[PDB]
Write a protein that binds this ligand. Structure first.
Ligand SMILES: [Mg+2]
Ligand SMILES: [Mg+2]
Ligand SMILES: [Mg+2]
Ligand SMILES: [Mg+2]
Ligand SMILES: [Mg+2]
Ligand SMILES: [Mg+2]
Ligand SMILES: [Mg+2]
Ligand SMILES: [Mg+2]
Ligand SMILES: [Mg+2]
Ligand SMILES: [Mg+2]
Ligand SMILES: [Mg+2]
Ligand SMILES: [Mg+2]
Ligand SMILES: [Mg+2]
Ligand SMILES: [Mg+2]
Ligand SMILES: [Mg+2]
Ligand SMILES: [Mg+2]
Ligand SMILES: [Mg+2]
Ligand SMILES: [Mg+2]
Ligand SMILES: [Mg+2]
Ligand SMILES: [Mg+2]
Ligand SMILES: [Mg+2]
Ligand SMILES: [Mg+2]
Ligand SMILES: [Mg+2]
Ligand SMILES: [Mg+2]
Ligand SMILES: [Mg+2]
Ligand SMILES: [Mg+2]
Ligand SMILES: [Mg+2]
Ligand SMILES: [Mg+2]
Ligand SMILES: [Mg+2]
Ligand SMILES: [Mg+2]
Ligand SMILES: [Mg+2]
Ligand SMILES: [Mg+2]
Ligand SMILES: [Mg+2]
Ligand SMILES: [Mg+2]
Ligand SMILES: [Mg+2]
Ligand SMILES: [Mg+2]
Ligand SMILES: [Mg+2]
Ligand SMILES: [Mg+2]
Ligand SMILES: [Mg+2]
Ligand SMILES: [Mg+2]
Lengths: 188, 182, 260
RNA sequence: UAUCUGGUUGAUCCUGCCAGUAGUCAUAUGCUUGUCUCAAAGAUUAAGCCAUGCAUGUCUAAGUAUAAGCAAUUUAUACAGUGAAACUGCGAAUGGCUCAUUAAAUCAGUUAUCGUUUAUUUGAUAGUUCCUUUACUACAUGGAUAUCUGUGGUAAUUCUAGAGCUAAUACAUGCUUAAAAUCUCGACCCUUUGGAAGAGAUGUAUUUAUUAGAUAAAAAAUCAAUGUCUUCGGACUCCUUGAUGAUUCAUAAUAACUUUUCGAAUCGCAUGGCCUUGUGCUGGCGAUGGUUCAUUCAAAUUUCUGCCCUAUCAACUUUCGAUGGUAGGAUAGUGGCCUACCAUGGUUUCAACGGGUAACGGGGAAUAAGGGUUCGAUUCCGGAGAGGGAGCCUGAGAAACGGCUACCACAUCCAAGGAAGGCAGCAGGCGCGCAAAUUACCCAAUCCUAAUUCAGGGAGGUAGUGACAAUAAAUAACGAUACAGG
RNA sequence: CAGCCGCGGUAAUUCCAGCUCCAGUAGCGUAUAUUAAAGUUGUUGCAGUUAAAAAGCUCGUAGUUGAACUUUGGGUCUGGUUGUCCGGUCGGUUUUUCAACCGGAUCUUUCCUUCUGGCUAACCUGUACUCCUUGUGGGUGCAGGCGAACCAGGACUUUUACUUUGAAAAAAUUAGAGUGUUCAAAGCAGGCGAAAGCUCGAAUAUAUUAGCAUGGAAUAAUGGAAUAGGACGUUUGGUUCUA
RNA sequence: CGGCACCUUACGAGAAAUCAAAGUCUUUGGGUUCUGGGGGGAGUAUGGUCGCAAGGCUGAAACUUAAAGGAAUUGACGGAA
RNA sequence: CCGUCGCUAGUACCGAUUGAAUGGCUUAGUGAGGCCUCAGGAUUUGCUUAGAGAAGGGGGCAACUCCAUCUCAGAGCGAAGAAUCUGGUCAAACUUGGUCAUUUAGAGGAACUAAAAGUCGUAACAAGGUUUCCGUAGGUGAACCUGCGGAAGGAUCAUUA
C-alpha cells in the first residue's frame, strides 16, 4: 500500500509516468513506529526473507555509551530533548535515531564509583593501589559532569529503534555535544 | 510447445507468367524428361539457382582465403557426387553455369531410361511409381530421386515383384487361373 | 515472475546438452547444486543422451535409485543434479569411472577415466576469506568450500581435492607458463600455456594463451582454469587434447581417415 | 537467380499516375479435393459474457497411527504388520493462458549490489546456556488439539457448535561438559628494583560506541613519563598485521544492553567394545532440524546506448516532490521512496512537454542484386493481467486471483432471514463477428511438484476435426493386329 | 463481361451455351492488406526555366559544412608466401637459380612514455687461456657492466571520432558442413564388428547499433610556450611541508 | 580585372523549345537552404495564429476521377500579316 | 467550351437542441476493506504449599515411615489469546460538480461530386471579335466587367541618324 516506487514520482524532467503495473510487495514500506517513552512495548514484523524486525513502541531505557571511558549501562531515558529533523517529534516526544535525549545517569554514576571511584556532580587495601593506578585519566567536559549531577545525561540515540527494537545511544562529548547544547538553548 | 517444425516453400514460380518462348522451352524440357508439371522444372531451377547464388557469394570473396576455399570446395564435391558436375570441371566458376537440363538428366526418372530397363521415359517413370526399381536393394518410387552416380551402376529392377523376376504379378496369375479352369 | 522458476523449455535448454529440438516440450532443469544452470550437466542428460545406458528418463531414475551412480564420492538420487566441469561420475556396476571434461567444440565429452585418477578432483579458487572464529577458508568455482588452505593459495589458483575426504592434496599457483584449460564461450574446451595477464582495474582480467600449435587466443580470467605445468597436466584430457583445429583441417582429417 | 508491359495521342517524345505482373508460416472467402510425411488453428470484433465437467496436491525401511479398518500370524504384557482420517511438514508464487495497459516505460545487449533478501542447494561449522561453588529435573518434561465417537442447527454453501477420550520432529518448556588465558576487584609489608594470597566477569545473536585490521627508505640529539637484564661501566637486540582497482571491507578484541535467537527431552535400520560383572560406562549407518559464512536457484534495483507517427503539441516541471541538499522515517537494502527544514533548481528546437497508435519489447517473419520497406497477438526470452480498481493474510518468494477483504460493473442459489461467484487453463456454449477445432484418450514419453522409485499432472503427449502453411507424387503402361505419317 | 484498355446499337473472336483450345494443376480463383516492380519517397538514387516544385528579397541563432602547413625520403640486414627449378621423391614431399607480396629490426640531424627497483637473458667483456686439424671451429668461467627476456610499482597521460583483430551479441530461425527420412520437406542422427564388442558425430559462419580489448596514426576535429606565471637542471637560496 | 548582353558544334544537356549553363549525372557523391510527389475536391473545412478590416501565414480529409499536364509534329482554322 | 439557375443520388462540412454516450484526468465531500496502531480481555492454562474428604493417598498406629497426594473457595504471579476498539495509512468506490479525448442522434443551413441528351447567356481558346493573366479594390444575373500596379505564357526579341 505505502510503497517505495520510483514508478510514481513523475520523472527527472516532469512527464507523468503512467501506472505501469500494480505496485509490488518487494517495493513496500510499513507504517511508522515513532516510539515515545511510556511503558516498554515491542511488536515484531515478519519482513522479507522472514527475518523479524523489532519495532520499538513507547521504549523506556537503553545502553547509552561513553567514548572517553569506553562503557555503557542498563540506563533509563527521561525525555526527547532535541530532535534535529523535526520539532513535532519533541512535542509528541517521539524518541528516534540521532534525537538528543536526557539519560537517567544513576547507573553511569554507579559504574564510575566502581571504575574510578571519585564521584561526579560536585575500605580495602590492595584495591586502593588499583584505584591509584587508575583515575586522573579523563577529566570530563564540564557539561557532562553537570548532567551527571542533575541525573540527566545528554545523549544522542543512534540505534534506529523502529528497525532494531533496542533504544541504545550515545553520551554526547566535545564539539558535537556543544553544538547540540547550543541548538537546545536556541529552541528554549 | 515443442519447436516449430521448419519448412521451405522451396520451389518457386517465375516472375512473369506468359513469356511465350520460355513456356515453349519448359514444355520441351518436360517432353525430354517426362515431367507431370512445370512445377518440377521450377523446383529444379530453384535448386540450381541456390547453387548459383552460393557460387556468386564465394566469388565475391578471395579464392585462397578460407571460407571460399572450403565451403566452395565442399559444394563442388557434392555436385560431383550428385553427377551433375563433370570430372574435368571442379573449379567453382564451372558450377556457376550448370543448367537445369543437366540436373534433370541426373534423375532416377532418366537413369532408368538411360540404362535401358524401361523403353520410353514415361514408361520408366510409371515403373518407378509402381513399386519396381531399387537403387540399392530398397525400392525407390520417387521419379525425382537424383541418382548418386556412385550408385548408378547399382540401379536394378526390384528384388521382389516382376521384371526382376521374383513373382509374375496379378494379371499373369489371373491368366494362369483361367488356363487351369479351362 | 512471482518467485523462482521451476521449468526449463527444451529450446531454452543450454546447447551443450546437445538435446533434440524435438522429442518432448521441456528439458531437465538442473536443480540447485554446486554448478551454474548453463555451465552444468544434469544426470539425465549424462545417462540418456551421452552414454545411452538408459533408454529413457524413467530408466535413468531407476538407475539412480539403484545407487550405482556416484557424482564426486557421494551417491546422488536426483535426475537433475548438476554435475559440472571436473566432477567425477563413477558407475560402480561397469566400473566406468568418468570425469566431466569439455570437448574442443564445447560440449561435455564422455571421458572414460581410470580408477586411480578418478579419485581426486582438480578445482579452481573463487574466494579466500576468513569465516567465524577467525578461520581462513577457500571457496571453489566448482562448488566446495574448504577450511584451512595453505596461506599461499590465492584467488584463481587450482586445488587438487582428495574428494573422498574433501581436503587439499596440492595446488597450482596461477602464473605465466602454466598449463591452463578454458571454460567460457568461443575458446571453451581448448588447452594452453598462459603468456600475459592484462590487469585491468575492475573490467575483467584477460589472459593471452597459446596452445601446443602456437595458436594464440584470449579469454577472461573467470573463464580459465589452471590444469598443470606445460607438458604435465594433472588430469587426463580427451582425444584432441584442447587443440581445436581449423574447419578445413578438420575436414581433411575426416576425409583422410577412411578406415572401413 | 538487378527483367517491365496496356492506357491522354490524329501521330510523336516526355511529366505522370492508373492498370497489369510476382511473392507473403498474411487473413478471409469461392469452387473443387484420391494418397504419403508435416502440421498451425476465437490474436484481429468484445482483456465481452459464461451452464457443465475437469486443470494441484502429496507419505517413504525412516512424523503421528489400539480406523471398535484391512488383514493375520508363530517380537509387543509401553510400542513394532498395513493404514482411512486428521494435525505437522512441504507444494499450491511453477506451469498454462492472454496482450488490456504500457512509448525512455517495457525490452535488447551492457555494467554494477563496496546497495541488498535469497525456502531450496551443496560446502561449512557452535565444550563458556551455570552465576559463588556443603544436599540440584533426568535411562526421557507439560497440557492441549484434530481423526473418531457423540449431542446438533440450517431452506441452503468444500457450514461446523457442544461433550468424551487421543497423539506428535504439533506447540510449548527444559538437562548435561571443563582446562587455560585475558579483563574488573583485593588480608598486607617496607621505605623501594616496589609485589602479590585470593574474589567477580568473558559463547552466539543484539546495539551503538571504541580499538586493531599496519607497511616509500636509512642515522640522531635529548626534554617529560621509566620499563627488562644488570657480567651495577650501562645495554636494550630478535618487537604484529588478509583481500580488493577501491572501504568505516573481511575479521578480531574492549563495553554494555537483550521483553536472551540458537545451543538435537527427533524417526528407520543394525545391535558393537571394556569389565571397576553393574545391566555399568561406552560406540555404528543414517534422517530432520538449527547459526551466520559459502554456493546454487534466484531477487530487487542499477550503469551506458538504442524506440512508431505528430509543432493543426513550445514551453513543461515546481500550490498537491519538481531538482538538489541536510537530517530523520521507512525498506531486505540504495534512493524525494516518505517527513521536517532550507536552497531554486530540473528538462527543452541535439524536439522537452503534450497528443495519437487499429503499439506489449526483443529473438525473429515476409519481401529479397546493393540500400531497403513493411509485419512481429502467436511455439523461445523478458514484461505486464486474471471483469475493473483497490487492500492484505500465509509464506524464502505473491500485493497471488483455479487465496482472502472491500467497492464498482456483471451476474447465480433461495423457504427472503441469508449464501455463493471471476474459463485472458483445457473442452464446450453464447455473444460478437469476414474470421478460428473435440465438453474425446492417457501419463508410456517430455519434464515438473511433494512426506517423494511408488501419487498426481487439460503442463505435456495421443488421436478427433483441419485444403492455415509446407514436402513427396496415382489418375494407365507394354504389346499385338487394323488405318495413316517418316 | 471488363483490374485497365474496353466490348454491346442485327456480320459480337470480349455477353450466354457445345466443340475445340490455352494456362496452372490437387490445386486454381476472388477480396483486402503488404513487399517487389516504385530512381512513383531517392543515403546509395528523383525532380523544381517551362510538366508538381526556388520562399518577392536580404538578415540571421541552431544545425550542416569549411582553404593549404608540421616526419618526408634513402640505405642495412632479417621473418615469412606462393608461382617458379627438378620432382631431391613412395598422385603427394625439400631446397636452390629466382620472384612479387606482407611484415620486423634498425641507421639516417631521429626515440618507441619515463624512471624507482627486481634477473641483468646475453656476452661489449677477459679473469686461468686452451678440451685441441698447423686455427679464433669450440666453453668449464666470474670483480666493472650492454637490460627489453620479462615483471611491479610509481609518475602523468591532449582528448576524441575513424578503422584493426579479439572477447562478449541465449537456443530456435537464417546461412552452412556431415549423413540414404526410400526421395524430399526434414531430423540429429548414425556407422562397423567376432556381427561375444568397438566406433564417428552432434561443426563452422553471421548478427556490424552501444559498452569492453588491442594494434594503427592517414583522414577529421581537438589541445599546447606570446603579460611565457613556459620547458628542462650541477641551479643556488628559500618558503610550506610530510614523516 | 568587373555587372544589367551573339554564332557554331556539341563531344557536355536536355522530352524538346533550347542551354556556354539549364554542362562536368546510371562513368550516379564540391558545400548548403528551401520546395514537389496523378489530377480535382482545395489554398477550401477546421483549428491555430496574424490583423482595423479586406485578407495573410499555416493547412485536412471524406469523396471523386483516367487521365491533368508538358513540349513539340502534321493538319484544320483565325474579324493575324 | 465556361458559369449561374433546375432534376436525381451520395460524401463530408457547419449547426439550435442548454443534446446523449463512453472513457481519461479532476474540485469538494463522503468513504468500504485490510495493515500497523491506542487500548480491550471472551477463554486457555503453568508455578505458588493454598485446606480438604483421602483408608500402606512416599516402604507398617503418628505434620500419610504424607506420594506430580483426593482435588476444588484459593488468590498472587505469569504466558498465549478472539470479538470489540482509539488514531494513522493505503485507498477502491460513491455523491455532485469540472474538464480533455473519442464517439454519436440532430431540425435547418451551405457546400462539393457524379450523371448523355434541361434554361439564360458566350467568359476563355483564333488580335475568340474590348489581347490574355496576376494582385488588388468596387460592382453586378451568370459567366464576368472596371480601376490601379504589374506581367507576357503577347498580338512585338526591329527604325535606324
Ligand atoms: Mg533465512
Ligand atoms: Mg508389392
Ligand atoms: Mg567488480
Ligand atoms: Mg530496386
Ligand atoms: Mg495532354
Ligand atoms: Mg485515341
Ligand atoms: Mg498496383
Ligand atoms: Mg479475442
Ligand atoms: Mg508463468
Ligand atoms: Mg581504527
Ligand atoms: Mg566491519
Ligand atoms: Mg537517507
Ligand atoms: Mg509493434
Ligand atoms: Mg495495445
Ligand atoms: Mg511479440
Ligand atoms: Mg490487439
Ligand atoms: Mg511469454
Ligand atoms: Mg472475460
Ligand atoms: Mg489481484
Ligand atoms: Mg480460472
Ligand atoms: Mg495461477
Ligand atoms: Mg477456453
Ligand atoms: Mg480459417
Ligand atoms: Mg495444452
Ligand atoms: Mg478431415
Ligand atoms: Mg500413390
Ligand atoms: Mg457470333
Ligand atoms: Mg514501395
Ligand atoms: Mg518523380
Ligand atoms: Mg512550376
Ligand atoms: Mg515563385
Ligand atoms: Mg508568393
Ligand atoms: Mg583541411
Ligand atoms: Mg538451410
Ligand atoms: Mg494531389
Ligand atoms: Mg480507517
Ligand atoms: Mg482587338
Ligand atoms: Mg468570347
Ligand atoms: Mg477577350
Ligand atoms: Mg457592373
Amino acid at each position: 500500500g505505502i510503497s517505495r516506487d520510483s514508478r510514481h514520482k513523475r520523472a527527472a524532467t516532469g512527464a507523468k509516468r503512467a501506472q505501469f503495473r500494480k505496485k509490488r510487495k518487494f517495493e513496500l514500506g510499513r507504517q511508522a513506529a515513532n516510539t515515545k517513552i511510556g511503558t516498554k512495548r515491542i511488536h515484531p514484523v515478519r519482513t522479507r526473507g522472514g527475518n523479524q524486525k523489532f519495532r520499538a513502541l513507547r521504549i523506556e531505557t537503553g545502553n547509552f555509551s561513553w567514548a572517553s571511558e569506553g562503557v555503557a549501562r542498563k540506563t533509563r531515558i527521561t525525555g526527547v530533548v532535541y530532535h534535529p529533523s523535526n520539532n513535532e517529534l519533541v512535542r509528541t516526544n517521539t524518541l528516534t535515531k540521532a534525537a538528543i535525549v536526557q539519560i537517567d545517569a544513576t547507573p553511569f554514576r554507579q559504574w564510575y564509583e566502581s571504575h574510578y571511584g571519585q564521584s561526579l556532580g560536585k575500605t580495602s587495601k590492595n584495591t586502593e593501589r588499583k584505584w591509584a593506578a587508575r583515575a586522573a585519566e579523563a577529566k570530563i567536559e564540564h557539561a557532562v559532569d553537570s548532567q551527571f549531577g542533575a541525573g540527566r545525561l545528554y545523549a544522542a540515540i543512534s540505534s534506529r529503534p523502529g528497525q532494531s527494537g533496542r533504544c541504545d545511544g550515545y553520551i554526547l562529548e566535545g564539539e558535537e555535544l556543544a553544538f547540540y547544547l547550543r541548538r537546545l538553548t536556541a529552541k528554549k | 510447445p515443442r519447436a516449430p517444425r521448419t519448412y521451405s516453400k522451396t520451389y518457386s514460380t517465375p516472375k512473369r507468367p506468359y513469356e511465350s518462348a520460355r513456356l515453349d522451352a519448359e514444355l520441351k524440357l518436360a517432353g525430354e524428361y517426362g515431367l507431370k508439371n512445370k512445377r518440377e522444372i521450377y523446383r529444379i531451377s530453384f535448386q540450381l539457382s541456390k547453387i548459383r547464388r552460393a557460387a556468386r557469394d564465394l566469388l565475391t570473396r578471395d579464392e585462397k582465403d578460407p571460407k571460399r576455399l572450403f565451403e566452395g570446395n565442399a559444394l563442388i564435391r557434392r555436385l560431383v557426387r550428385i553427377g551433375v558436375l563433370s570430372e574435368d570441371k571442379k573449379k567453382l566458376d564451372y558450377v556457376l553455369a550448370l543448367k537445369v537440363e543437366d540436373f534433370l538428366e541426373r534423375r532416377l526418372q532418366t537413369q532408368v531410361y538411360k540404362l535401358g530397363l524401361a523403353k520410353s521415359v514415361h514408361h520408366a517413370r510409371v515403373l518407378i511409381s509402381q513399386r519396381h526399381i531399387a537403387v540399392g536393394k530398397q525400392i525407390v518410387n520417387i521419379p525425382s530421386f537424383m541418382v548418386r552416380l556412385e550408385s548408378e551402376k547399382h540401379i536394378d529392377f526390384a528384388r521382389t515383384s516382376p521384371f526382376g523376376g521374383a513373382r509374375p504379378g496379378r494379371v499373369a496369375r489371373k491368366r494362369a487361373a483361367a488356363a487351369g479352369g479351362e | 515472475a512471482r518467485g523462482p522458476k521451476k521449468h526449463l523449455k527444451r529450446l531454452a535448454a543450454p546447447h551443450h546438452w546437445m538435446l533434440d529440438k524435438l522429442s518432448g516440450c521441456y528439458a531437465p532443469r538442473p536443480s540447485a547444486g554446486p554448478h551454474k544452470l548453463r555451465e552444468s550437466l544434469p544426470l539425465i542428460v549424462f545417462l540418456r543422451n551421452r552414454l545411452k545406458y538408459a533408454l529413457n528418463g524413467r530408466e535413468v531414475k531407476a538407475i539412480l535409485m539403484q545407487r550405482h551412480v556416484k557424482v564426486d564420492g557421494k551417491v546422488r538420487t536426483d535426475t537433475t543434479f548438476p554435475a559440472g566441469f571436473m566432477d567425477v561420475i563413477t558407475l560402480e556396476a561397469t566400473n566406468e569411472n568418468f570425469r566431466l571434461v569439455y570437448d574442443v567444440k564445447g560440449r561435455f565429452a564422455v571421458h572414460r577415466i581410470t580408477d586411480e585418477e578418478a579419485s581426486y578432483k582438480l578445482a579452481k579458487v573463487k574466494k579466500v576469506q576468513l569465516g567465524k572464529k577467525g578461520i581462513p577458508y577457500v571457496v571453489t568455482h566448482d562448488g566446495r568450500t574448504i577450511r584451512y588452505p595453505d596461506p599461499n593459495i590465492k584467488v584463481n589458483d587450482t586445488v587438487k581435492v582428495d574428494l573422498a575426504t574433501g581436503t587439499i592434496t596440492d595446488f597450482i599457483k596461477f602464473d605465466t607458463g602454466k598449463l591452463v584449460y578454458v571454460t567460457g564461450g568461443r575458446n571453451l574446451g581448448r588447452v594452453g600455456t598462459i603468456v600475459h595477464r592484462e590487469r585491468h582495474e575492475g573490467g575483467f582480467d584477460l589472459v593471452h594463451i597459446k596452445d601446443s600449435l602456437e595458436n594464440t587466443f584470449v579469454t577472461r580470467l573467470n573463464n580459465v582454469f589452471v590444469i598443470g605445468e606445460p607438458g604435465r597436466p594433472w588430469i587426463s584430457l580427451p582425444k584432441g587434447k584442447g587443440i581445436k583445429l581449423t574447419i578445413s583441417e578438420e575436414r581433411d582429417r575426416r576425409r583422410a581417415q577412411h578406415g572401413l
